[PDB]
């Protein structure tokens, strides 16, 4: 159910952001907290909402797209554990909706409170910086600013011919049961001159038995895009496959990708001199083991045939609650 929108009966207050600056590339995030109050009375079905600007999201790197873009949210209660309201959040509209239950039918001057995780929006806010973060609760605007200090994905050896590669897991499907994940790898973020270049996507880090991840030809799809202008790349790891700045070249790799070795995939980039982006759609198992991963690149050559090198990179994500 869900009847009336009682925003006008509702007035939030005591709003604070746990903190106003963080690095979302090291599991940075914050929380919005607040008290609310119901001038008057209501009934099962009424509801109020909260809405988030472009800058933040309410699900961060947990994907819900395979769940009708709907994020369950732990119930709102009284002290006897009585479920006062049921809550959820729409990934698309960035709308929290709290819908009362069989509890409100006999009370007035109602008071509750929430605390809700807030994460960056990697598409909306793709470059380190300060953004307007005006949050709406029950038609009242609460204004803030968020600074994102992304750990530059431009990372690798300090050598002119040094292997350099980074990557992030930017969406994980915990809810649907499909157990999918989305990961952006950047190969040659430094856009150096690189010889016989090799890449590896692992479903684990040092220990297989320590990660749920699974990387096989059957569990894993890969799309590769030559970048036009590296500077135009996101600090956030988001990559829009439809950016003109990216040219999908997945068709140049039919015979350069191997799922031979366990929980790994290898691409043969060859002789390259600019950045490439790899979209990973993969899956992890029901082991409950955390999803940990690592990508590595090595290059030989270039114009010497010696001074070979290698650089690696690790991912895992963290879960918060509201």
């Amino acid at each position: 159910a869900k009847g009336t929108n009682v925003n006008d009966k509702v007035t939030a207050s005591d709003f604070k952001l746990e903190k106003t600056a963080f690095d979302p590339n090291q599991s940075g995030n914050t929380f919005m907290a607040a008290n609310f109050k119901v001038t008057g009375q209501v009934k099962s079905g009424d509801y109020f909402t909260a809405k988030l600007p472009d800058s933040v999201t309410g699900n961060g790197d947990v994907d819900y797209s395979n769940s009708n873009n709907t994020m369950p949210i732990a119930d709102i209660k009284s002290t006897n554990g009585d479920v006062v309201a049921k809550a959820t959040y729409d990934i698309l509209t960035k709308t929290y909706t709290f819908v009362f239950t069989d509890y409100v039918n006999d009370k007035e001057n109602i008071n509750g409170q929430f605390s809700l995780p807030l994460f960056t929006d990697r598409a909306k806010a793709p470059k380190s910086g300060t953004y307007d973060a005006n949050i709406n609760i029950a038609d009242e605007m609460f204004d803030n600013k968020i600074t994102y200090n992304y750990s530059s994905p431009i990372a690798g050896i300090d050598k002119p011919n040094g292997a350099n590669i980074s990557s992030q897991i930017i969406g994980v499907d915990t809810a649907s049961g499909q157990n999918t994940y989305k990961q952006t790898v950047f190969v040659n973020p430094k856009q150096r001159v690189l010889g016989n270049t090799w890449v590896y996507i692992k479903g684990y880090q040092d220990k297989i038995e320590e990660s749920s991840g699974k990387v096989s030809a059957t569990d894993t799809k890969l799309r590769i895009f030559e970048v036009n202008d590296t500077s135009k790349l996101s600090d956030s790891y988001y990559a829009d496959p439809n950016d003109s700045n990216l040219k999908e070249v997945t068709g140049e790799f039919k015979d350069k990708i191997s799922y031979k070795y366990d929980n790994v995939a290898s691409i043969n980039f060859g002789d390259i001199n600019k950045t490439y982006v790899v979209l990973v759609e993969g899956h992890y198992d029901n082991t409950g083991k955390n999803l940990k991963t690592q990508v590595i690149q090595e290059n030989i050559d270039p114009a010497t045939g010696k001074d070979y090198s290698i650089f690696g990179w690790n991912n895992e994500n963290v879960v918060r609650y509201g």
């Binding site: 961060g60 995780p117 050896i157 994980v172 918060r320 509201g322």
Partner: peptide
């Protein structure tokens, strides 16, 4: 040789 990054998100209480 290597580095790293980690991410974060909400399970939705579940």
């Amino acid at each position: 040789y290597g580095g790293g990054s980690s991410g974060g998100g909400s399970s939705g209480g579940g």
